[PDB]
Design an enzyme around this catalytic site. Structure first.
Site, PDB file in Angstrom:
ATOM      1  N   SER A 178       0.775  -1.208   0.000  1.00 21.97           N
ATOM      2  CA  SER A 178       0.000   0.000   0.000  1.00 21.97           C
ATOM      3  C   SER A 178       0.816   1.272   0.000  1.00 21.97           C
ATOM      4  O   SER A 178       0.491   2.206  -0.737  1.00 21.97           O
ATOM      5  CB  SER A 178      -1.011   0.012   1.125  1.00 21.97           C
ATOM      6  OG  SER A 178      -2.091   0.894   0.835  1.00 21.97           O
ATOM      7  N   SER A 229      -3.501   6.483  -2.113  1.00 21.99           N
ATOM      8  CA  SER A 229      -3.355   5.071  -2.381  1.00 21.99           C
ATOM      9  C   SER A 229      -4.240   4.573  -3.470  1.00 21.99           C
ATOM     10  O   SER A 229      -5.372   5.004  -3.613  1.00 21.99           O
ATOM     11  CB  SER A 229      -3.556   4.256  -1.156  1.00 21.99           C
ATOM     12  OG  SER A 229      -2.788   3.053  -1.211  1.00 21.99           O
ATOM     13  N   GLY A 452       0.700  -6.583  -3.993  1.00 18.61           N
ATOM     14  CA  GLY A 452       1.444  -7.753  -3.721  1.00 18.61           C
ATOM     15  C   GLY A 452       0.940  -8.380  -2.501  1.00 18.61           C
ATOM     16  O   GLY A 452       0.275  -7.742  -1.701  1.00 18.61           O
ATOM     17  N   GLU A 454       0.107  -9.576   0.647  1.00 21.52           N
ATOM     18  CA  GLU A 454       0.084  -8.929   1.938  1.00 21.52           C
ATOM     19  C   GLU A 454      -0.552  -9.935   2.894  1.00 21.52           C
ATOM     20  O   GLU A 454      -1.469 -10.728   2.582  1.00 21.52           O
ATOM     21  CB  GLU A 454      -0.622  -7.566   1.929  1.00 21.52           C
ATOM     22  CG  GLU A 454       0.421  -6.447   1.608  1.00 21.52           C
ATOM     23  CD  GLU A 454      -0.012  -5.047   1.923  1.00 21.52           C
ATOM     24  OE1 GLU A 454      -0.817  -4.551   1.010  1.00 21.52           O
ATOM     25  OE2 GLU A 454       0.416  -4.437   2.906  1.00 21.52           O
TER      26      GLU A 454
END
Length: 800
Positions: A178, A229, A452, A454
């Site tokens: 993030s 974000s 990706g 997480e």
């Protein structure tokens, strides 16, 4: 130094001065003692080995600490020659620590781009840099990554090159958590393309660009990590022409955070648009939409925060606005968008109450409905009915069903989200539409931006979808590498056999995507009118538990229903809501109304009115397929410290990323073959000194290795270079190191010697000139007080 000019100003952030280097690589080093080590508080810190407990180790620290840790809690340390290596994969010490440490060092020096094999690691500066510098752009133009220092334009240019050279399509895969700052890169890559190959003799090149700032208003928001974000994933296809000049683009969106639209965490906020609009830069809008300027009037959008200091909602509003236009949208559509974005706010204001003596929901007023209704080109009533008395179709007819207060509030929210989404999808399509040209296309360069792997203490449905995406992407790499590797050993003539590295992951993938796998069981049960999350759960087990290895039952330590064994690790998944989330339940009566709205656009969005995961997969396939007819180019974005501080890094935080990145897996795979590979001359020069007494640039290195009490195994020669395992080259150097002490120490001496030898020649010369001076003064001190001499003095002048 000589080279660097192009950058000049950027240089310091790309490369270091030729002595800074020199002063770093050429320094004292004690291999046998210097080491990296485990550390309870800090992940891995460095130290010096003190003693040896036979299988225990005591080490000093760098800060001053002494710990006795296992033999394998201890890791070697690269010779200084590898200080701030552009490509960590050139290191002769492929560890966990050495990688962390390399990144870290070149960051404290303000170098954000370091390569780790094929990757292009990138660390968030958290401050400004002359890197995106318009001078650099050129500099990196037409340069292999060996002709220039680690940087993204390297990747981005090479792609282009390669594109025209090999006549293959390309891709760039950007990925990180993030706060890693991918959008930023992505965008930056994109500009790059547009610049270096433009045919806008308004223009594509802008639309292309303008795209972002629209999507961003709608699919971006203030996260507790980032301030802008990306709440969705994306894939752009830049379709280059035949010549090599720009021709088309293509966006695709994946997994949008629908929840923001209705919710928001305490330190976060919803999509920008909302705050943009209520900013008041275009007051008509406020009256047009029938809202206020105070967000606390719209529950849906002020559950968290409303204002962010680093963002100027007023400026953006225009940016956004203007972008729409450029994007070719009709005013009307540009009107739908707005009007539609406000309806949604209003919905969250829609209130209801229990009918008396009944458990039914009855409208608590036609104040808001009125607005929502009008704004959408609907009828207040018809709307409130459908909402309250959903008229269903169970059997072969249409059965009118009554809902509860709780049921309405929830359905409303479902449409709010549904509508927003769709719209967002539409906008994208419409964009794509403009981005469609007639000119021929021969190849494209895909730029993929997604999240990706997480891991959270809480992993729900959304996590699976993303993780699954990544575990695929990973295998995608592992293979490309296997293919790639194998070419070298083929080019050189080495004899190395090995199995595809992807294969290791096929286990996990099959379990998810295959027929009796998770998704299926998930999407079947969705067909059972009376299934439960619990139901689903059991089906999951009865079929995979005990029979499947990657399948496991959670180890209590929230709650968890099932863990999976992904490449990055074990993920504990909670199955609660899945069934629903996966069904995308929407009140069809209402949708009906939309379908016949006076607001065409709204009408459109819902004409296509199957599970959710059903697509995700379809889309994810269409993608991974597009990814294949591509020459993959990888970029891994990293986030230094949660605290937002330039030049800093939490260890374990970066460590994490590295595992889930693929970086640590690329190092692994590297360290299994023959990592370090020395070019022959590059081999001669540096090591001749080892047994210098033992020509050809090749046969030589051969002959050389004749000496040394070294493993004649660990290496392997071939047509252009030698192949070497780990810590070998490390071994070499060491020997070398000793050999210079010899060489130097001896060369010092003579100098020293000689130095003083010239001092004697001076001392001696001086011998008398002193005396002369010596005595000469003394005279005077004696004389100057003598009558006769004073006399001579006053008199000395009258003379001639």
């Amino acid at each position: 130094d000589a080279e660097m000019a192009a950058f000049g100003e950027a240089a310091p952030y790309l490369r270091k001065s030729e002595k800074e280097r020199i002063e770093a690589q050429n320094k004292p080093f004690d291999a046998k003692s210097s080491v990296f080590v485990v550390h309870p508080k800090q992940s891995f810190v460095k130290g010096t080995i003190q003693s040896k407990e036979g299988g225990k180790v005591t080490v000093k620290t760098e800060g001053g600490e002494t710990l006795t840790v296992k033999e394998d809690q201890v890791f070697s340390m690269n010779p200084p020659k590898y200080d701030k290596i552009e490509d960590m994969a050139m290191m002769t010490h492929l560890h966990e620590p050495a990688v962390l440490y390399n990144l870290k060092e070149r960051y404290a020096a303000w170098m954000i781009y370091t390569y780790s094999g094929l990757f292009c690691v990138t660390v968030n500066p958290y401050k400004w840099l002359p890197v995106y510098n318009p001078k650099v752009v050129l500099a990196y133009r037409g340069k292999k990554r060996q002709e220039a220092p680690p940087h993204i334009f390297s990747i981005s240019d090479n792609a282009y090159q390669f594109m025209l050279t090999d006549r293959e399509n390309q891709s760039i895969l950007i990925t990180g958590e993030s706060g890693a700052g991918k959008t930023v890169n992505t965008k930056r890559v994109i500009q790059y393309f547009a610049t270096i190959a433009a045919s806008g003799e308004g223009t594509l090149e802008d639309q292309i660009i303008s795209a972002n700032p629209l999507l961003e208003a709608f699919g971006n928001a203030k996260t507790v990590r980032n301030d802008n974000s990306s709440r969705f994933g994306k894939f752009i296809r830049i379709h280059f022409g035949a010549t090599g000049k720009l021709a088309s683009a293509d966006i695709e969106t994946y997994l949008l955070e629908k929840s923001r639209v209705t919710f928001q965490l305490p330190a976060e906020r919803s999509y920008h648009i909302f705050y943009q609009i209520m900013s008041n830069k275009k007051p008509e809008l406020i009256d047009m939409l029938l809202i206020t300027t105070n967000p606390y009037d719209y529950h849906y959008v002020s559950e968290g925060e409303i204002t962010v200091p680093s963002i100027d909602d007023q400026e953006e509003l225009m940016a956004t606005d203007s972008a729409i236009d450029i994007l070719g949208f009709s005013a009307d559509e540009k009107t739908a968008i707005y009007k539609l974005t406000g309806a949604v706010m209003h919905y969250g204001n829609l209130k209801f109450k229990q009918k008396q003596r009944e458990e039914q929901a009855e409208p608590d007023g036609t104040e808001v409905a009125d607005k929502a209704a009008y704004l959408m080109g609907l009828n207040s009533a018809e709307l409130l009915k459908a909402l309250c008395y959903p008229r269903v179709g169970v059997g072969n007819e249409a059965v009118t069903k009554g809902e509860t207060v709780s049921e309405v509030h929830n359905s409303v929210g479902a449409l709010a989200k549904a509508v927003y989404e769709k719209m967002f999808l539409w906008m994208v399509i419409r964009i794509n539409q403009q981005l469609d040209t007639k000119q021929p296309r021969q190849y494209f360069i895909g730029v993929l931006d997604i999240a990706g792997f997480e891991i959270f203490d809480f992993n729900s449905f959304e996590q699976l979808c993303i993780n699954f995406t990544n575990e695929k992407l990973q295998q995608f790499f592992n293979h490309h590498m296997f293919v790639l590797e194998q070419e070298e050993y083929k080019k050189e003539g080495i004899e190395w056999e090995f199995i595809d590295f992807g294969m290791d992951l096929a286990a996990c993938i099959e379990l998810i995507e295959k027929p009796m796998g998770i998704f299926s069981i998930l999407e079947e049960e969705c067909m059972f009118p009376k299934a439960t999350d619990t139901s689903f759960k059991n089906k999951l087990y009865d079929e995979h538990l005990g029979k499947s290895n990657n399948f496991q039952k959670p180890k209590p330590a929230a709650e968890a229903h099932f863990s999976l064994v992904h490449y990055a690790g074990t993920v504990d998944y909670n199955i609660s809501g899945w069934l629903e989330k996966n069904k995308d339940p929407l009140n069809e009566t209402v949708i009906g109304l939309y379908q016949k709205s006076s607001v065409k656009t709204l009408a459109l969005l819902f004409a296509t009115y199957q599970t959710v995961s059903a697509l995700f997969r379809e889309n994810l396939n269409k993608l991974m397929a597009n990814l294949r007819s591509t020459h993959p180019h990888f970029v891994r974005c990293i986030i230094p410290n949660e605290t937002k501080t330039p030049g800093a890094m939490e260890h374990e935080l970066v460590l994490h990323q590295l595992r889930c990145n693929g970086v640590l897996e690329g190092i692994r795979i590297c360290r299994k073959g023959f990592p370090s590979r020395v070019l022959y001359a590059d081999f001669k020069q540096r090591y001749r000194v080892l047994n210098a007494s033992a020509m050809d640039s090749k046969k030589a290195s051969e002959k050389l290795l004749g000496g040394g009490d070294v493993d004649h195994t660990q290496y392997a020669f071939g047509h252009t270079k030698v192949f070497f395992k780990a810590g070998l080259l490390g071994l070499l150097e060491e020997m070398r190191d000793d050999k210079l002490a010899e060489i130097i120490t001896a060369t010092q001496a003579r100098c020293r010697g000689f130095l003083m030898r010239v001092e004697y020649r001076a001392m001696v010369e001086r011998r008398e000139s002193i005396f002369c001076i010596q005595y000469n003064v003394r005279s005077f001190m004696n004389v100057k007080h003598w009558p006769w001499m004073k006399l001579f003095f006053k008199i000395k002048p009258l003379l001639k």
